[PDB]
Subunit: 579 residues, 2 copies
């Protein structure tokens, strides 16, 4: 049908018959003449209807009509040129017109952003808009960039099952009843973790898959019921090898938006990340680091600071703050499961004000500004109490400071690996009210149960779990965790010991993960890997906050599908097969 791309027409094309196919972006009438912009994937040419049957037929045209037009390229009359677009100095004088597909009046115009429900219900229209459409095209280039790096390093692309055994690993599975086995269920996978490890036992050596993953969560934190991971695994490797290839993937991926990524990326320990930034996904686009004051307040008589941790965060020029917003700081603190946020105001003199300053000793008041590296005019925030909660509060406080003061360059890309993760977290340590709760559950995995201990934690990890370190690693971009992996356990005895920690008996381990444990009986290799949050990465590259903007047909909060009205009840006929 089509002879030319709409965006390809130039002065050089004058006098030639052309045929374009696409959409009417707009129509405007002046004199007895009809003017349209004809849009296709390659861009836009103006098309005019001046005389005869074509003109009569063009009276039918409206925004988003799908059409084919035939006409003669002409240079636009003097003064009509559109300098802004590549087609700007031509137009097509239409000769023939066929309406391929009529459009009704639009639920929203394409130069408008509608509410979420409307954009999803009419996502086929939303994707005609420049931004949404380009996001999806970007995603395609992103995939290809990753694959090209992986192929260059001899990775094998392997598809893994999505109908699996329901395993008692963390998080709720989506279930699928089996017609041919009344009462039995498949589960959709959370990750291909177990499969990729089996592929290592299989001798595949270097595996990747851009894989669909499924998790039935309470769907906060910008979650989707199904999401995409770039999954990788390698045999005979240490962490450095997984990091080096990951970094090659990241460089090619960022090249897609014309950013040259400087390698290698910074690395920081979990304990250093937590100490310096109060977060294991630290945002390094600005400073405002935590300063420890525990030892500084060792001999204090101020009750609030008689705690196992005291930490500070300095707000630049924050003394000049008005009091109404200082009360909200307390609300900010409470909204997060914390009792409050103490503060010391450093007035223009260098002298300390606020409800804290008077309670400190002369010796404490004195060396304070220096210790926290504050300057006159600043507001120093303090958090005391159990270290994890106090640090998290200070980590959240520095981010809020950076928002409020614009320390945060919207063009910058700041990456880091977080390495040397503890092997375990404490199951449920703090009350919702903010206190230390009585520990019920066993130890829980920091990343996952299949994560290896570091060599000098091998003998100790089940006797001294809280201090045990792992070969796990996260990669962080602008305060977002964009990927995570680890060196795996590849011995049965070590994997059972880990399971014992988690309240999984020898018999329970064999019943639930036996297929993995037995595979380790047949010459399993050292192996390790990583998984990237592909939707997050694509969202960051497109410059949007929500991953919904980079999925073709996403769900909205609650797993509701405005496009198809899924999920929906089924018939009783379908139900009798067979659960």
């Amino acid at each position: 049908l089509r002879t030319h791309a709409a965006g390809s027409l130039r002065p050089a094309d004058a006098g030639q018959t052309v045929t374009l196919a696409g959409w009417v972006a707009r129509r405007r009438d002046h004199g007895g003449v009809i003017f349209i912009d004809l849009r296709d994937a390659s861009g836009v040419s103006q098309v005019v209807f001046r005389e005869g049957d074509v003109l009569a037929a063009a009276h039918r045209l409206r925004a988003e009509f799908c059409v084919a037009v035939t006409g003669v390229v002409e240079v636009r009359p003097e003064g009509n040129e559109n300098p802004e677009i590549p087609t700007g100095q031509i137009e097509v004088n239409a000769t023939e017109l066929t309406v391929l597909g009529e459009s009704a009046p639009l639920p929203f115009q394409l130069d408008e952003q509608a509410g979420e429900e409307a954009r999803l219900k009419y996502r086929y229209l939303d994707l005609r808009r420049e931004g949404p459409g380009n996001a999806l095209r970007l995603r395609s280039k992103v995939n290809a960039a990753a694959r090209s790096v992986l192929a260059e390093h001899d990775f094998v692309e392997i598809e893994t099952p999505t109908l699996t055994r329901s395993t008692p690993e963390g998080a709720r599975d989506f279930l699928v009843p089996a017609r041919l086995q009344p009462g039995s269920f498949y589960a959709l996978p959370q990750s291909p973790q177990l499969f990729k490890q089996l592929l290592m036992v299989a001798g595949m050596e270097r595996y990747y898959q851009i894989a669909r993953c499924y998790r039935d969560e309470d769907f906060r934190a910008d979650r989707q019921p199904e999401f995409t991971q770039l999954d990788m695994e390698m045999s005979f490797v240490e962490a450095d090898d997984v990091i080096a290839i990951s970094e090659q993937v990241l460089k090619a991926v960022w090249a897609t938006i014309g950013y040259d990524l400087p390698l290698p990326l910074p690395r920081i320990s979990y304990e250093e990340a937590m100490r310096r930034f109060g977060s294991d996904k630290p945002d390094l686009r600005f400073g405002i680091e935590l300063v420890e004051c525990t030892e500084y307040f060792k001999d204090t008589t101020f009750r609030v600071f008689q705690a196992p941790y005291v930490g500070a965060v300095v707000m630049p020029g924050g003394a000049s703050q008005p009091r109404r917003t200082l009360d909200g700081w307390q609300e900010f603190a409470k909204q997060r499961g914390h009792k409050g946020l103490a503060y010391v105001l450093v007035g223009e003199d260098g002298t300390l004000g606020g409800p804290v300053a008077k309670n400190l000793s002369d010796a404490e008041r004195d060396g304070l500004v220096a210790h926290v590296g504050a300057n006159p005019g600043d507001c120093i925030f303090f958090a005391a109490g159990p270290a994890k909660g106090a640090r998290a509060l200070l980590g959240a406080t520095r981010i809020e400071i950076a928002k409020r003061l614009d320390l945060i360059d919207p063009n910058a890309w700041a990456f880091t690996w977080v390495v040397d993760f503890p092997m375990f977290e404490a199951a449920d340590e703090a009350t919702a009210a903010g206190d230390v709760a009585v520990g019920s559950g066993a130890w829980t995995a920091m990343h996952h149960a299949f994560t290896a201990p570091k060599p000098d934690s091998v003998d100790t990890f089940d006797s001294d779990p809280g201090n045990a370190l792992s070969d796990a690693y996260d990669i962080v971009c602008n305060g977002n965790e964009i990927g995570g992996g680890s060196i795996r356990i590849h011995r049965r005895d070590i994997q059972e010991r880990v399971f014992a920690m988690m309240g999984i008996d020898h018999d329970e381990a064999q019943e639930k993960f036996g297929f993995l444990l037995d595979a380790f009986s047949y010459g399993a290799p050292p192996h390790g890997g990583i998984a990237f949050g592909w939707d997050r990465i694509t969202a960051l590259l497109a410059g949007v906050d929500s991953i919904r903007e980079v999925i073709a047909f996403p769900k909205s909060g609650g797993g509701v599908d405005p496009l198809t009205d899924a999920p929906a009840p089924i018939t009783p006929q379908q139900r009798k097969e067979s659960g």
Copy 2:
């Protein structure tokens, strides 16, 4: 750990310290010396343990132990050279040994093919075998070959949802209950069909996805509950355009095994395919075509041939057949829902024998051999009755003839498109016993409901359904359907008319496919596409019959998973959430 690839060692490497990591393919002892073949992905080097601690430690080694060895490359003693392998003239004199992973005695040896249950339960071991492992590596190259063609022609790779609305389209869906919506269910998709069409309405123009598809079938015909399709769609196209790009995909895919595919591929109509070969997935690696005898027997008085169709298939030299096997031909016929298979024996003279010949007229007996193009010594098989059943029988008969006579070159690749498919099949036309049954159901779709009629069937298709032709097309390889697509309907009124045919009322259409029908209100473009059976294609390229051999972790008959013992019953705790 590793310094060198095991397959990379040569004479030039003599005297150098190397470190290999992989598996012990075998161990053999002679003198006080231990000899192993060390295998990794790149191949095999012999490694020897001659003196000291290494030798003592090597007494522990067995088949499939995963190890790292350090040693000095030496040229093999005169007479020891293995001319068959690239490493053949060196060996490594081991200096150090670390057992990375012990192996227990194998359930089967790697130079053996075990039974299916064993191969699946221990698929991680089965994939260490040369053939299975190479199959998976081939698959990876196959994907990449397709993607490179699609990228070259500006296709956008787009991921489509796997959690969807359960639609009343053909075939049983896998269901997924939704925790957040007690009583409601997602369905897994049969194909991305509806989504790819919406992406056309979205202006994406050229789409592809290598997609996971789900179907809960009775699991005969080498079916898997989940399978992979290469899915494609384009806007502003006719059949030729979909075929031309498909052919580019096929050429690159076949290039993976060093076959240069001659383009363009042959094309044949559905009616011609059925007439000539009694099949719409004809096997063109041999001849033995159907010859119509309907008009030839127009004036016959032999009751069996007083039928609306009579067809023949000539077996080369089949008169010299013994009688015991001629009775089995009848069983062959009955095993397929047919009453029998008539035959005429052409003896060495050219004179006709058998139970048919005597019943024909002089004039019928005479011109017979000529008409069917037989030669003395041949056996002519006949099928009479309703055309569809008789042709299918003759189509099945010619394939059996070709097996029995080896007319069938195992290296040949014979392709064809089958075009001009009828728009509809008759719902259930024949009895299991072989008779014409009373038609119950409405008309059913030949490919799917979204398939467009040809231009000169547009007004007629719902008044003269049986004669209505479509713009559907299949591509066939060596008697296998390897892909199928069509030009779509893109107007609401035409799609409702199709639904009416199928017993889907206006109200039922809007309730079940409204999201598609409404999308057609907003300037839908002409569009068309194709889906390839990716597992079948990969199986053909690997040279195996079963697609199980080209899936990393396949199910066996019944959707049973010997690897993980899925599907399995769930806990009552899990069940209370929430169906």
